[PDB]
Amino acid sequence: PLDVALKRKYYEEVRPELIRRFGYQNVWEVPRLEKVVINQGLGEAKEDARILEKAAQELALITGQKPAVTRAKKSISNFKLRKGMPIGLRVTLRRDRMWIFLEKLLNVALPRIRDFRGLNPNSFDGRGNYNLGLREQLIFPEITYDMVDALRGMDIAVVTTAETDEEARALLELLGFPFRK
C-alpha cells in the first residue's frame, strides 16, 4: 500500500475519536470505510450514441479505474428501452484508490459545487451507508471544460461497516464530509 493523507488521517485522528465517542470494546467494532461505488446512469447513450466512451474515459480520469457498462434488465416502452441496452457506467473503488478519490472529493470536488452548502444529513442509508448525487462531472479536478462535451452527473455510494447511521455520520464528518445540518 501507500501513503494518502486521508487514510493516515483515518487511523491517526478518526479511529481513536470514534472509540472514545462510542466505547468500542473490539478494534474491529470501530467503523471502517468499505468501498466507494460511482454510478453514472446515463440512458442518454441508450441508442443516441456510444457516448459511454467519452464518459468512461472521464470516469477513468477521475477515479483511476476503468468503469464497466450496465445494461437494461427489462424492456420499458415509456423509457424507449429495449432489454440489454448499455445505459450506464459503474465503478467500484476500494482500498487506496478509494481513499485517493475520497480525499480529492472532499478537498477540491465538493467545494467546486456552486451554491454548495454542505452534504445532506438525511441521506444516510438507515444502516450506516451514505449516498449523494452530483449533477456535473467537471466538479472533479481531472476534468476541464475543454475536455468535456456534455454535462453528466453521478450517484456516489460510500459503504461503511457501521451498523447505524449515528456511527456512520460520526465516521464521515470526522474524515471531513461537510454536512449541511
Partner 1 sequence: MKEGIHPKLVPARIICGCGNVIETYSTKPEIYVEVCSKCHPFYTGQQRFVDTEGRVERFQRRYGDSYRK
Partner 2 sequence: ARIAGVEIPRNKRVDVALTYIYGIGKARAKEALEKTGINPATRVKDLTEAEVVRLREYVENTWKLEGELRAEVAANIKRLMDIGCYRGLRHRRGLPVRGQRTRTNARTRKGPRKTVAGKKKAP
- The single residue among 2, 145, 151, 181 that binds partner 2, judged by CB under 8 A, is 145
Q: Per CB under 7 A, which of residues 142..171 are in contact with RNA? A: 151-157, 159
Q: Least separation, in Å, of the C-beta of 105 and partner 2?
A: 16
**Residue 117 sits in the site that holds RNA (CB under 7 A):** no
Please name which of 105, 106, 94 lies closest in space to residue 176, comparing C-alpha atoms.
106
- The single residue among 16, 84, 111, 133 that binds partner 1, judged by CB under 8 A, is 111
Of all helices (H) and strands (E), which one includes residue 38?
Answer: strand 33-40
Give every CB contact of residue 17 below 8 A, 6+ residues apart in sequence: 174
Helical pair 52-63 and 95-104, crossing angle rounded to 10 deg: 90
Give the nearest residue (CB) to Mg ion. 128
Strand partners, 93: 36
Binding site for RNA (CB under 7 A): 1, 26-29, 35, 37, 39-44, 46, 65-74, 76, 78-81, 86-88, 90-92, 94-95, 120, 122-127, 129-135, 151-157, 159
